[PDB]
Design a binder for this molecule. Structure first.
Ligand SMILES: *[C@H](CC(=O)Nc1cccc(C(=O)Nc2ccc(Nc3nccc(-c4cccnc4)n3)cc2)c1)CN(C)C
Length: 349
């Protein structure tokens, strides 16, 4: 350790480059061991993430390789970019830790979501979400696990997605916050690109309500909250379900579902006149198109960006940006083989 020094941050040992100073913890969990620091070389504040046990198992190593490769290849203003990556260990044998250095954002969507939002800020945040999600979809990355904790914002209202979710896999399956997962993911029906639109709808509804739309101890409790509010899905949808989950879903008491005016009343929106009246109905209309159980009837990312509530921000330069090309991302390896794949990524950057 010549260019490195150690410091205990939030009950975790950070062995970082001497260029990163005044390390401060930036408190949460689940994902991950993150702190804030000042980069002396760049004269800017950064966020340093220490990966939690990347070689504990193959799921950790596959997720670490995937995140490191995608953060490097993707270059979009609404997706967090990798400023730097390093390991304090000198050889492949000694190699055990990975530190991802990214731009420091001011707050997580989980805190911004709780703020009284104006239609200008709200539509801008959703526009950026839809921009980032569009950019990921263009490269074949279907997130499937978009949630407020996976999204960060800056003081100037600029938004960035942290994660890539299940990314390039072909089956909606994970394994602690499941309130944003689309019904087709929960019930295991298969998905299309608009699976991420449900998560955007959940997040938007929460911005309006200041309460989680579909809370619950588990998926069974969660599904009740979905049918109580949106109504029981069509027989056509319930036909597309597996006979065993279908049995439970069809045996539930039938709900007509509260209308979107009743789900999101004018009371939850800025009052009085004329611009605010216009904007309350536009926001509610977009929610009625995003918060749809049946994905065959749910709005796409492209059409959502074309919606009058969002289209006010539409910029072809941000929306129609070229997709990232490519490593690869669906082949299994031993933990030793992932370690070497991860080591070469950290070293060749
Ligand atoms: C709500 C969950 C909730 O409320 N969590 C929460 C509350 C208050 C503060 C924080 C918090 O400190 N979160 C953060 C996160 C990030 C940042 N800035 C940042 N910049 C760049 C990169 C990162 C980063 C990268 C990787 C992992 N984490 C962060 N962060 C500032 C503050 C969190 C639950 N609802 C869903 C109900």
């Amino acid at each position: 350790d010549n260019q490195f020094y150690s410091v205990e941050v939030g009950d975790s040992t950070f062995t970082v480059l001497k260029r990163y100073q005044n390390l401060k913890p930036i408190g949460s969990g689940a994902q991950g061991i993150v702190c804030a620091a000042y980069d002396a070389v760049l004269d800017r504040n950064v966020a340093i993430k220490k990966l939690s046990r990347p070689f504990q198992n193959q799921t950790h190593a596959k997720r670490a390789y995937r995140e490191l490769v995608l953060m490097k290849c993707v270059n979009h203003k609404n997706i967090i970019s990798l400023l730097n990556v390093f390991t304090p260990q000198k050889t492949l044998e000694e190699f055990q830790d990975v530190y991802l250095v990214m731009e420091l954002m001011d707050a997580n969507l989980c805190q911004v979501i709780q703020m009284e939002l104006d239609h200008e800020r709200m539509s801008y945040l959703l526009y950026q979400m839809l921009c980032g999600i569009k950019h990921l979809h263009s490269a074949g990355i279907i997130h499937r696990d978009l949630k407020p904790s996976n999204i960060v914002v800056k003081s100037d209202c600029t938004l960035k997605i942290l994660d890539f979710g299940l990314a390039r896999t072909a089956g909606t399956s994970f394994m602690v916050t499941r309130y944003y997962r689309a019904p087709e993911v929960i019930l295991g029906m298969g998905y299309k690109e608009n699976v991420d639109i449900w998560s955007v709808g959940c997040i938007m509804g929460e911005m309006v309500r200041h309460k989680i739309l579909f809370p619950g101890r588990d998926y069974i409790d969660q599904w009740n909250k979905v049918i109580e509010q949106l109504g029981t899905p069509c027989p056509e949808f319930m036909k597309k379900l597996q006979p065993t989950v279908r049995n439970y879903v069809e045996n539930r008491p039938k709900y007509a579902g509260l209308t979107f005016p009743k789900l999101f009343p004018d009371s939850l929106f800025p009052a009085d006149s004329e611009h605010n009246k216009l904007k309350a109905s536009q926001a509610r209309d977009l929610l009625s198109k995003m918060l749809v159980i049946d994905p065959a009837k749910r709005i796409s990312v492209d059409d959502a960006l074309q919606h009058p509530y969002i289209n006010v921000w539409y910029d072809p330069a941000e929306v129609e940006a070229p997709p990232p090309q490519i490593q690869l991302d669906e082949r299994e390896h031993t933990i030793e083989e992932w370690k070497e794949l991860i080591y070469k990524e950290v070293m060749n950057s």
